[PDB]
Symmetry: C2
Subunit: 164 residues, 2 copies
């Protein structure tokens, strides 16, 4: 908490091969998980989650995407990573990328719920985005078990949103 969002240059990101500007404020936030297999310890590691971001971008390329598919990413220790950033249409939620923000939580949460550190980072990213008119003040957080993992989904269901 209290740090800055890690910019594209910190994790040595490649310029995108195409960047489509978003038509004003996003009013939705789609939460996805990178997967229990992301590894291809380093759940926090010593700045290991930073090369994972770099890698995810590389993966997203071979897949035909214009750049890493998410607008932001968050690791289990609470550090936020700038993906496509604010104002750019991502390629994360088929057919719904145009007016939403796509966030990816690094790791799998099909069995274990997210750390309070990760949850806090997410709440922060939302509050700050809204403060700066990047996100609509009513933006709903959307996800499903298939998207962010049963453990993550179950948690939002219990705390009617992020816990505490």
């Amino acid at each position: 908490l209290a740090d800055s969002i890690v910019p594209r240059q910190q994790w040595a990101a490649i310029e995108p091969r195409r960047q489509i500007k978003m038509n004003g404020r996003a009013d939705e936030i789609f939460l996805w998980q990178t997967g229990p297999d992301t590894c291809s310890g380093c759940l926090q590691d010593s700045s290991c989650t930073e090369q994972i971001v770099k890698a995810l971008q590389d993966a997203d390329f071979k897949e035909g995407n214009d750049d890493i598919k998410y607008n932001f990413l968050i690791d289990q220790d609470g550090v936020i990573y700038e993906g496509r950033g604010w104002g750019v249409v991502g390629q994360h939620t088929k057919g719904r990328d145009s007016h939403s923000i796509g966030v990816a939580v690094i790791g799998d949460f099909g069995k274990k719920e997210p750390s309070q550190a990760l949850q806090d980072a997410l709440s922060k990213l939302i509050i700050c985005g809204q403060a700066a008119e990047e996100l609509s003040s009513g933006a709903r957080l959307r996800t499903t078990p298939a998207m962010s993992g049963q453990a993550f989904y179950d948690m939002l269901d219990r705390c009617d949103g992020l816990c505490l």
Copy 2:
């Protein structure tokens, strides 16, 4: 909580005479109170009513008259937690003589010589900084600087015993 910062145009701001950009993040936040004499201009209002937007405009007018390039502060916060955009992020203000080049000036609307600021105002203050830091506009260790003369005894006393805003 989820509300955006109020942009210049929402309070009918007139464009700056000149806008000087700021090289590098700001490493310090200077706190100033608009004073007990804030209700002066026309003569509750300082509370929830949005008469506050009219006060921000009034301040700008006062600052122009004195020769400033625009309203003196980068941001202003009222007692209900509403944050208003002054000069905004990345621009040098004219709020703390000699120290404007690498800092952010925040004015708190009211008189805090005797009464501490509402909790709503503190949280907004807290949010502004944290979001400034997240967006890399303020350094990660930026110090909230002030004195009783600048922001009122009551405000100074509170930050002084909590080494910054109280949790």
